[PDB]
Amino acid sequence: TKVKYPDGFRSWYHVKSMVIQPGHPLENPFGGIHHVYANAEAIQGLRGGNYPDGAVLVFDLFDYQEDNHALVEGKRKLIGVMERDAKRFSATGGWGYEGFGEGKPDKRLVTDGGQGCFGCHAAQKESQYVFSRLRD
């Protein structure tokens, strides 16, 4: 019951972005510029509908470089994936969690069935474990 690599995610809907800089409590490991993407099924869930199985959210994390009062995207550090499967992933709330180092399909990171990822997202039980909100 592994989470699939989300092929083609870069074509998906861009939900939002945030920058985490040194000093912030999530600097390790989430420091950098990140972008959140969602496929069609996740949008139904984000819109205030419910999440169909098959919904996928991606957190795409880049290192940044400071260039004359601009922050410029550098190398991809990793992508984080949540894949909705109420029955397959019922142990962590109906979402499977995986990380891919540098976004590579062969660099799977999660060793504990996603319990560590879930421990934090569990704080968002109310929104079905998703922190991101749709915007305009």
Binding-site residues sit at: 16, 27, 34, 66, 69, 117, 120-121, 131-132
Residue 87 binds its own copies, judged by CB under 8 A: no
CB 75 within 8 A of CB 102: yes
Cβ atoms within 10 Å of 68's Cβ, excluding its own: 5
Binding mask 17-36 for Zn ion (x = CB under 5 A): ------x-------------
Please give the DSSP secondary-structure letter assigned to residue 4.
Answer: P
Instruction: In angstroms, give the least distance from the CB of 120 to its own copies.
Output: 15
Answer positive or negative: Cα dihedral of 94, 11, 27, 18: negative
Instruction: In angstroms, give the least distance from the CB of 18 to its own copies.
Output: 6
Instruction: Label residue 35 exposed, middle or buried (CB < 10 Å: 0-12, 13-18, 19+).
Output: middle
Contacting range for its own copies; rule: CB under 8 A; set: 31-39, 92-100, 110-118, 121-129: 31-39
Binding mask 108-127 for its own copies (x = CB under 8 A): --------------------
Residue 50 binds its own copies, judged by CB under 8 A: no
Distance CA 118, CA 22 (A): 24
